[PDB]
Design a protein around this ligand. Structure first.
Ligand code: NA
Ligand code: NA
Ligand SMILES: [Rh+]
Ligand SMILES: [Rh+]
Length: 129
């Protein structure tokens, strides 16, 4: 599923991300835009052999089991395929554990490089929330 900007903002707010660990909703929308272009089906291979899945590009090195990442963990206790659903529940619940892991949203290299220190409120401007 390819979300609209405001549709994804509303789904993220309904699932508890607005100000989660102090990150405003625009941060999460900005991260999703640069990670997946709001596409739940997005997949990308990493140099280490792990893969990033879904709207927030959650990695198989730590967070999910894809059956092909050796010496990895599954800290969200999910198959990676769950992160590709039109229903963003698994991605949201796994993002909350990631952002709680010590480095905040710096866990998402795209957030640190494209959203941190920018006017992220712009990502939710005009949305009925
Ligand atoms: Na990415
Ligand atoms: Na894994
Ligand atoms: Rh939902
Ligand atoms: Rh509202």
């Amino acid at each position: 599923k390819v979300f609209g900007r405001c549709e994804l903002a509303a789904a993220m707010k309904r699932h508890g991300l607005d100000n989660y660990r102090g990150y405003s909703l625009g941060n999460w929308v900005c991260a999703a835009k640069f990670e997946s272009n709001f596409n739940t089906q997005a997949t990308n291979r990493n140099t280490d052999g792990s893969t990033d899945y879904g709207i927030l590009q959650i990695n198989s090195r730590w967070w999910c089991n894809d059956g092909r990442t050796p010496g990895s963990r599954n800290l969200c206790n999910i198959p990676c395929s769950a992160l590709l659903s039109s229903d963003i529940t698994a991605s949201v619940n796994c993002a909350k554990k990631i952002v709680s892991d010590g480095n905040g949203m710096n866990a998402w290299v795209a957030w640190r490089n494209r959203c941190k220190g920018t006017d992220v409120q712009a990502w939710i401007r005009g949305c009925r929330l």
